[PDB]
Amino acid sequence: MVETEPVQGCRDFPPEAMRCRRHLFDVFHATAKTFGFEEYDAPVLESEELYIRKAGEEITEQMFNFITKGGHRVALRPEMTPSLARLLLGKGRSLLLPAKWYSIPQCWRYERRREHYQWNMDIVGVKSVSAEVELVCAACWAMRSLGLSSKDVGIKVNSRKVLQTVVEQAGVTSDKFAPVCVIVDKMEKIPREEVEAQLAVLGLVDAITTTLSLKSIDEIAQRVGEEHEAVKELRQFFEQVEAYGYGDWVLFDASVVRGLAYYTGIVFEGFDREGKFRALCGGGRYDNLLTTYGSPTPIPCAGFGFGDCVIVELLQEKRLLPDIPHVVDDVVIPFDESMRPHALAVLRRLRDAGRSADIILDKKKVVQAFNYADRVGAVRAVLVAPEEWERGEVQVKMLRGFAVPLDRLV
Amino acid sequence: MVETEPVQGCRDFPPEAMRCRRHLFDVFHATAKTFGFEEYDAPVLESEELYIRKAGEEITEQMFNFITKGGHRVALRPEMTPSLARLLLGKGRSLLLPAKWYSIPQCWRYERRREHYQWNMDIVGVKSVSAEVELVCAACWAMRSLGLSSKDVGIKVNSRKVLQTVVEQAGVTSDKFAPVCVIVDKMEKIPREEVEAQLAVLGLVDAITTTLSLKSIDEIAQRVGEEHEAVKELRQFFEQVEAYGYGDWVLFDASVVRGLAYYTGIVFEGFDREGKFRALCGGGRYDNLLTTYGSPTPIPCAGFGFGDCVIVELLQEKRLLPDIPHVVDDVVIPFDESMRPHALAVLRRLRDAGRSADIILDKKKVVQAFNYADRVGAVRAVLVAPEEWERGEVQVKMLRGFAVPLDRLV
Numbered sequence: 001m002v003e004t005e006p007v008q009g010c011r012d013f014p015p016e017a018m019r020c021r022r023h024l025f026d027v028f029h030a031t032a033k034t035f036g037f038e039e040y041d042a043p044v045l046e047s048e049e050l051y052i053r054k055a056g057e058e059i060t061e062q063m064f065n066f067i068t069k070g071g072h073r074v075a076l077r078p079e080m081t082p083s084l085a086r087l088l089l090g091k092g093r094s095l096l097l098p099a100k101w102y103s104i105p106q107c108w109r110y111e112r113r114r115e116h117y118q119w120n121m122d123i124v125g126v127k128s129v130s131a132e133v134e135l136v137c138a139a140c141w142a143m144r145s146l147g148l149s150s151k152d153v154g155i156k157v158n159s160r161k162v163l164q165t166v167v168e169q170a171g172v173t174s175d176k177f178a179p180v181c182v183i184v185d186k187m188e189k190i191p192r193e194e195v196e197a198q199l200a201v202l203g204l205v206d207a208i209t210t211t212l213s214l215k216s217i218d219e220i221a222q223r224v225g226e227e228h229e230a231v232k233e234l235r236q237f238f239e240q241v242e243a244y245g246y247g248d249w250v251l252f253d254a255s256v257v258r259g260l261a262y263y264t265g266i267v268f269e270g271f272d273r274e275g276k277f278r279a280l281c282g283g284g285r286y287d288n289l290l291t292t293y294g295s296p297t298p299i300p301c302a303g304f305g306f307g308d309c310v311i312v313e314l315l316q317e318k319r320l321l322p323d324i325p326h327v328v329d330d331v332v333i334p335f336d337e338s339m340r341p342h343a344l345a346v347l348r349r350l351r352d353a354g355r356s357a358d359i360i361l362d363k364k365k366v367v368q369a370f371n372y373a374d375r376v377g378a379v380r381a382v383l384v385a386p387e388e389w390e391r392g393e394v395q396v397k398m399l400r401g402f403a404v405p406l407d408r409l410v
Numbered sequence: 411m412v413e414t415e416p417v418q419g420c421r422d423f424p425p426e427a428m429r430c431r432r433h434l435f436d437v438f439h440a441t442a443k444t445f446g447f448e449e450y451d452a453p454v455l456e457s458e459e460l461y462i463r464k465a466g467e468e469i470t471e472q473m474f475n476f477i478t479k480g481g482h483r484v485a486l487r488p489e490m491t492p493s494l495a496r497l498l499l500g501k502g503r504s505l506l507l508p509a510k511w512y513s514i515p516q517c518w519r520y521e522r523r524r525e526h527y528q529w530n531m532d533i534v535g536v537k538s539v540s541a542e543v544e545l546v547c548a549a550c551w552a553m554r555s556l557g558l559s560s561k562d563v564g565i566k567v568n569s570r571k572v573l574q575t576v577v578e579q580a581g582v583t584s585d586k587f588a589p590v591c592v593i594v595d596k597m598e599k600i601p602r603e604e605v606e607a608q609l610a611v612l613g614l615v616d617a618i619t620t621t622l623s624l625k626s627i628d629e630i631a632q633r634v635g636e637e638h639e640a641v642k643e644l645r646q647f648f649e650q651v652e653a654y655g656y657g658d659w660v661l662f663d664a665s666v667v668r669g670l671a672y673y674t675g676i677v678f679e680g681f682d683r684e685g686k687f688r689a690l691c692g693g694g695r696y697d698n699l700l701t702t703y704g705s706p707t708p709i710p711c712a713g714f715g716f717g718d719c720v721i722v723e724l725l726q727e728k729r730l731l732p733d734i735p736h737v738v739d740d741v742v743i744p745f746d747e748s749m750r751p752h753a754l755a756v757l758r759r760l761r762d763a764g765r766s767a768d769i770i771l772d773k774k775k776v777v778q779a780f781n782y783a784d785r786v787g788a789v790r791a792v793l794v795a796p797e798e799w800e801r802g803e804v805q806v807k808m809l810r811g812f813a814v815p816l817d818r819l820v
């Protein structure tokens with residue numbers, strides 16, 4: 001007997017499970033359309049080089065990589081953003097800006113689950129914080145579309161420029177900034193003795209702790225100035241999100257850095273207000289990535305990723321994922337095999353009119369055909385019997401036996 | 411500068427291309443719903459064992475496989491059907507039958523393109539040819555939904571039981587039947603001297619050629635009998651497809667075997683009636699696969715695969731793939747940055763009412779905002795200016811400047 005279980009750390013999606021996933025994706029798609037984002041895709045298999053950033057990131061530590069038979073180093077994408085950048089670079093001057101691109105790629109890791117789907121939304125060619133605002137509102141919009149309120153979740157928001165200044169003022173060559181954000185991001189999970197050790201292990205702390213634990217924007221105006229670009233940006237951000245109507249969804253948190261190397265400005269993180277779950281989504285501005293990839297002109301970018309697992313746990317906890325049973329409008333039941341041809345002509349017309357319809361495919365008695373119709377969640381059973389066919393009719397019966405002329409069925 | 415090109419033999423899908431792919435997938439999805447099929451998915455990464463059938467298949471010759479870091483032999487699926495079977499086996503008795511499952515997996519190969527998307531439709535637990543009928547009608551339905559007529563394409567249909575008998579009558583142990591179908595399938599591409607050599611290389615021909623070139627069902631009634639199960643099946647098949655209204659789409663071809671090992675009965679192949687393109691889709695009955703995988707009870711199955719490339723070439727040839735430009739209902743234009751907050755409250759309401767809307771994100775003059783709106787295919791531009799806002803109004807303008815009160819916009 002064969003191995004019925006999927007490969008280590010990956011999920012099967014039989015119809016029941018697939019309905020749950022499709023309910024989630026519908027929202028991701030519907031939200032992108034609402035916000036004017038265009039869909040894209042790229043291979044799940046990308047060159048390994050694409051992710052060699054050399055900043056001790058979890059995402060590049062836990063790459064699911066291998067060597068092709070022909071020698072080339074490739075990998076199953078751990079994230080989409082580098083793929084996006086490559087596409088953007090290839091377009092170059094032909095790419096009209098600003099561009100708003102989205103996708104729902106499966107992304108991978110080797111280690112616990114080894115794959116997840118991650119909704120990606122990104123805005124390209126927008127200098128101002130209006131990008132981050134839109135993005136953050138898109139994420140709130142989706143969560144709200146799934147049944148969640150500002151009582152259930154929020155989005156913590158920060159800027160890396162604050163810390164950039166503190167690092168810069170402290171004489172630290174700017175090349176150390178990315179490795180620092182990555183360690184500081186660990187602060188949540190690892191202890192302060194362990195996190196302090198990594199910053200010292202990178203050749204160096206006090207000012208970092210104090211600034212991470214600042215609880216308000218006023219307090220960072222004290223420390224940095226009321227027109228550090230970061231203060232002006234965050235105020236504009238919050239004012240814009242206020243104005244869009246999602247003020248109760250967003251708040252400031254000076255400890256939020258995110259784990260990725262390329263964020264340069266505003267960064268953000270979705271969370272459940274009960275403190276039970278990991279981050280629901282994560283994102284930020286990344287204005288230098290494309291310059292890093294070799295763009296002859298800097299290209300401002302911002303975006304986020306929004307996983308398919310934490311959100312589902314959350315929705316299951318809040319009882320917002322009722323099992324969605326399969327449905328179909330009509331189930332056509334031939335009285336017996338001599339009626340099959342006629343049953344098919346009826347099936348054809350039901351479908352021609354835009355309805356979803358089955359026909360009983362195997363041979364069985366009418367009552368068992370009816371039970372089957374109930375089991376597949378048919379809204380209506382259409383019995384095709386010889387007596388009624390003579391009258392140009394069939395027997396209809398609503399499941400959620402009046403005879404009906406064929407033309408009136410639809 | 412980074413490598414902008416995708417990995418060898420795989421496709422990027424920027425927004426333009428993705429619109430074409432989504433137009434195709436919409437049809438695959440819409441057709442499955444019309445026919446009552448339920449969506450499923452499974453990992454693109456499956457155990458390599460799953461595909462070791464030992465019958466010289468192209469699909470298992472050109473497996474994109476590798477060894478995980480932990481030693482396990484895995485591969486990127488070359489086809490979905492084995493995944494489907496595994497899922498079905500795992501369900502066992504809990505799986506209610508008949509089941510009609512579909513998916514649009516990316517599938518892989520190593521060698522020319524190395525990936526394609528393949529719509530899969532399969533019916534489980536149906537003994538009779540009504541399964542093959544439904545499946546064949548689903549494929550015609552999709553092609554017709556894409557603009558194609560029975561003048562443009564057809565479906566060639568055969569049964570492997572015919573050849574099974576000829577092989578059986580000729581004393582050939584039934585274990586040789588699969589290897590034979592695989593060689594005979596090559597007959598299209600390779601010469602008869604080369605195809606004859608493989609059948610002799612498998613320890614053995616004349617009767618095979620003659621029966622492959624039989625041009626009608628009557629002629630196979632002569633050779634096999636008018637109640638070989640295969641004659642009764644094909645007549646039922648054609649009668650049912652006749653009755654559904656797709657008689658002009660289907661025809662008999664005794665040379666059609668298909669390249670896969672597991673087909674046991676009816677097999678079929680979509681084709682363009684101009685003889686320009688490879689097969690558009692392919693499928694058949696496979697009643698023994700699950701018994702092969704270890705099912706304690708035989709499970710009848712039939713299905714097909716329908717690629718994303720040949721169909722697109724065909725549609726491009728018939729001029730049925732006009733470029734689909736991006737669209738969005740509204741583009742909200744703040745007169746200047748002081749109007750941004752108000753512009754956002756308007757944006758919120760447009761979206762709240764189910765419309766797709768952008769807001770101009772960067773700072774620019776109104777005429778350039780208008781050009782942008784035209785470029786993204788906005789149906790309507792909504793200017794948010796201070797003079798009109800005082801009146802509780804905005805300036806609307808249809809692109810495919812009458813002032814309007816906020817409540818009337820939606």
Ligand SMILES: N[C@@H](Cc1c[nH]c[nH+]1)C(=O)O
Nearest residue numbers: 079081283284303304305
């Ligand atoms: N790539 C980020 C999310 C993101 C998309 N765009 C910008 N950031 C992540 O995987 O968490």
Ligand SMILES: N[C@@H](Cc1c[nH]c[nH+]1)C(=O)O
Nearest residue numbers: 489491693694713714715
């Ligand atoms: N797996 C077949 C198509 C198919 C699906 N179900 C049965 N046959 C192919 O790749 O051509």
Ligand SMILES: CSc1ccc(N)cc1
Nearest residue numbers: 078108109113114115116
């Ligand atoms: C849970 S599977 C997963 C895969 C890739 C990343 N970057 C994170 C998580």
Ligand SMILES: CSc1ccc(N)cc1
Nearest residue numbers: 488518519523524525526
């Ligand atoms: C054109 S890519 C492709 C991938 C897998 C199979 N079986 C066939 C084709």
